[PDB]
Structure 1
Amino acid sequence: NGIVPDAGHQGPDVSAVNGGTQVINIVTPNNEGISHNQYQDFNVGKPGAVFNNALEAGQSQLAGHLNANSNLNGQAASLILNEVVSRNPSFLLGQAEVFGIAAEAVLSNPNGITCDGCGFINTSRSSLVVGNPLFENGQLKGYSTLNNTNLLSLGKNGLNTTGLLDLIAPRIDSRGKITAAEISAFTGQNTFSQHFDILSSQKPVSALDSYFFGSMQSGRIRIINTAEGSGVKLAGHHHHHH
């Protein structure tokens, strides 16, 4: 019951295997190739969650045998955008798998995202955005972390993916092992393009320091904190107030 779709036209169908692994029959992709899914709640438990991007029945890693997603009509999604539209933060405590055609995946939740033993399967690029998507004339234009001080937290059990990983938030607090083909961590109050080019940056009211403890196992690591007055702190397992 961790994932609760919005009642409107962008809410996908969600069902759970024996109360466990959640399967999301994502909405039909639009002309941009984006399946834009909106949620009142988005949380993944230990048993994980599957985005059904399959045109034929088959074998998912987390859920076993699944039928095709009948919301797709001949064309799978290129980008699976999951947007939390409520005030509820997200907790990711297990794996998220794209079943079927490999895609990019984005979770946006301006209220905060916590990962702890989460990961992304069959994703070419996975992005966790503590912010909102920006739409203009019905097209995705990018993302915004403006006027937001909430946290992308990564816990001691870490985050694993074979694909590219973007960590996009006002601030990050990571305490575990991050594994990805490449890690990009862009922090501060910013607007971004769809590709996470930084388009603009605000000066925050107070410091937005990010903290990293643990390890990073990746081909490339890039970190950019655009907040004035702020930095990137390489922490031990606690950061006590001074």
Structure 2
Amino acid sequence: NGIVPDAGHQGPDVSAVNGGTQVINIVTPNNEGISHNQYQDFNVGKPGAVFNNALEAGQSQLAGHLNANSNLNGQAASLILNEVVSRNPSFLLGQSEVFGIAAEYVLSNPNGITCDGCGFINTSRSSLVVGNPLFENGQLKGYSTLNNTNLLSLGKNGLNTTGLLDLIAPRIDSRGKITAAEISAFTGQNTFSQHFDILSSQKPVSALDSYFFGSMQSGRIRIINTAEGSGVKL
């Protein structure tokens, strides 16, 4: 059971189909179209995980036939925000599929995220954020990696998606092949808008060095490091 929802209102319904693939019936989107899901644990194993963003029944790639997600109330998410609220880091070793209506996908975990052979299916954009979402008056205002020195790690088996990819962390350590339509990596201690515009930056008390080994199979790569002094090694 890699994914364990929070007990409260923003905990989605989580189950599994024969073979171990996890199925997540994401919570009702708010009026902005954001499904804000909170978790005590968020990990994807080799059998993968399916996030049900469907308004009609149909065939998922990883978990077979599923009904429409009743939680949606006829209103598919524009953004599936997965927020780890505990101190547990995340490990992604398999595919995350959005079943139904294609959406943006975010995993935020300020304790650390590791991706080793992970991928994202039917996402327009997927973002991995070692940091927290920022909310004002119940609305998403952006993200923060301030005062955080934890790591976004990408292992030897890499990361694949047909969509856009954002990698957001105090520091990144990547050792595998990253395949994506576009890759954006933002490092350092920053605050961000909803769309990962950098709004502010702070100088870390100690060096925050990032390391990119391996190939990046993408037509467009951007790397922004705001940690004045700290570098990007390739």
Q: Mark yes or no: TM-score above 0.5.
A: yes
Q: 1:230 maps to what in 2? A: 230
- Structure 1 residue 19: Cα displacement: 5.4
Checking the alignment, whether the CA contact within 8 Å between 2:19 and 2:47 is kept in structure 1 is no
CA distance in 2: counterparts of 1:189 and 1:58, whole angstroms: 42
2: CA distance, partners of 1:229 / 1:85: 31
225-234 vs 78-87, greater mean Cα deviation: 225-234
Q: Distance in 2 between matches of 1:61 and 1:219?
A: 26
TM-aligned CA deviation for residue 59 of structure 1: 0.6
The structural deviation recorded for 1:228 is: 1.6
TM-score of the aligned structures, taking structure 2 as reference length? 0.99
Q: Which runs of 5+ in 2 are unaligned?
A: none
* Residue pair 2:110, 2:145 contacting (<8 A) in 1 also: yes
Report the TM-score, using the length of structure 1 for normalisation.
0.96
Instruction: List 4+ stretches of structure 1 deviating above 3 A.
Output: none
SS of equivalent residue, structure 2 residue 70:
coil
Structure 1 vs Structure 2: percent identity of aligned residues? Answer: 99
Q: Deviations over 1:38-68 (max 9, x none)?
A: 0000000000000000011111111111111
Give the whole-Å Cα distance in 2 for the aligned partners of 1:62 and 1:169: 29
State the shift of 1:105 in Å.
0.3
- Superimposed CA distance per residue, residues 161-216 of structure 1 (whole angstroms, 9 cap, x where no aligned partner): 00000000000000000000000000000000000000000000110010001100
Q: Quote the Cα distance in structure 2 between the aligned partners of 1:113 and 1:35.
A: 20
CA contact (8 A) 2:170 2:208 kept: yes
Q: Distance in 1 between matches of 2:67 and 2:113?
A: 30
RMSD: 0.6
**Counterparts of 1:23 and 1:41, CA distance in 2:** 14
Q: How does 1:93-242 map to 2 (within 5 A)?
A: 93-234=93-234
2 CA distance for matches of 1:190 and 1:19? 40
Instruction: Quote how far apart the aligned CAs of 1:32 are.
Output: 0.7
Question: Aligned partners of 1:55 and 1:142: how far apart in 2?
Answer: 27
Instruction: Give the aligned partner of residue 36 of structure 1.
Output: 36
SS across alignment from 1:124: strand
Instruction: Give distance in 2, aligned partners of 1:19 and 1:129.
Output: 29
* Ranges in structure 1 where 5+ consecutive residues have no aligned partner: 235-242
Alpha carbons 2:179, 2:216 under 8 Å: kept: yes
Compute the displacement of 1:18 (Å): 2.4
Tell me how far apart the structure 2 counterparts of residues 55 and 221 of structure 1 sit (CA, whole Å): 34
CA distance in 1, matches of 2:68, 2:137: 31
Q: Displacement of 1:219 after TM fit? A: 1.6
How far 1:116 moved relative to its partner? 0.2
How far apart, in 1, do the equivalents of 2:232 and 2:195 lie?
23
- Note if contact 2:167-2:186 (Cα within 8 Å) is conserved in structure 1: yes
* Deviation larger for 16-25 or 125-134: 16-25
Q: Deviations over 1:6-35 (max 9, x none)?
A: 000000000011251000000000001000
Q: For residue 233 of structure 2, give the secondary structure of its aligned residue in structure 1.
A: strand
SS at match of 2:43: coil
TM-aligned CA deviation for residue 229 of structure 1: 1.9
